[PDB]
Write a protein that binds this DNA or RNA. Structure first.
Lengths: 77, 101
DNA sequence: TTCACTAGCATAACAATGAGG
DNA sequence: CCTCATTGTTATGCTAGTGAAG
């Protein structure tokens, strides 16, 4: 029941893609999956990244709408 | 500053209003820093913006940046209204072109 | 060659996801 | 529980640089 921090544009796009990639070839560890996902994202153009960036913006806005008193609180090492 | 109590109360509620507006407009803290630097000629790091939003800055610095942020939010809201009107206009234009095609 | 503050520069934490230590 | 692996947003620990007092 703890509030999690909102996900940026990458996390949105990666969450979409890694489910498809796991259904595509199972028995593949998310480490190589995330390496490949980041490598692919680095090659996208701004025209291609636009909708996910806008989705992350909408997500943060809706997060503040839901939790007006949220504060990200990490635990430093 | 008449007294630090009422002034700091007003300032700490203004900080929450500033965060709320920057979130509903889609700016990251680094984005606000970059835009402040570009329209006022003085760079502002994301660090100072986080500290402002956490009221972790000297009251003199809080009040020194408050007018800067007010001008910034005026310009940002103008830009947002402009983009919104332009998007709806282009949508009506696309309706016209598609129905008339 | 002392203490208090100031402002970045860096980098950790953490969001998702699940397999396998 | 935990570690991994990824990019992006946010909080903050460590500096170099600045005065002030003695």
């Amino acid at each position: 029941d703890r509030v999690k921090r909102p996900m940026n544009a990458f996390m949105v796009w990666s969450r979409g893609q890694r489910r498809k990639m796991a259904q595509e070839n199972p028995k593949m560890h998310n480490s190589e999956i995330s390496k490949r996902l980041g490598a692919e994202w680095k090659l996208l153009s701004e025209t291609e990244k636009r909708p996910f960036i806008d989705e992350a913006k909408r997500l943060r806005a809706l997060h503040m709408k839901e939790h007006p008193d949220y504060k990200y609180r990490p635990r430093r090492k | 500053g008449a007294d630090m109590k009422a002034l700091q109360k007003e300032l700490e509620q203004f900080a929450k209003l500033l965060k709320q507006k920057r979130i509903t407009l889609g700016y990251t803290q680094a984005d606000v820093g970059l835009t402040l630097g570009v329209l006022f000629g003085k760079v502002f790091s994301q660090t100072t913006i986080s500290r402002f939003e956490a009221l972790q800055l000297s009251l003199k610095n809080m009040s020194k940046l408050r007018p800067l942020l007010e001008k910034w939010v005026e310009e940002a809201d103008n830009n947002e209204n402009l983009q919104e009107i332009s998007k709806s206009e282009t949508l009506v234009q696309a309706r016209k072109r598609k129905r008339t095609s």
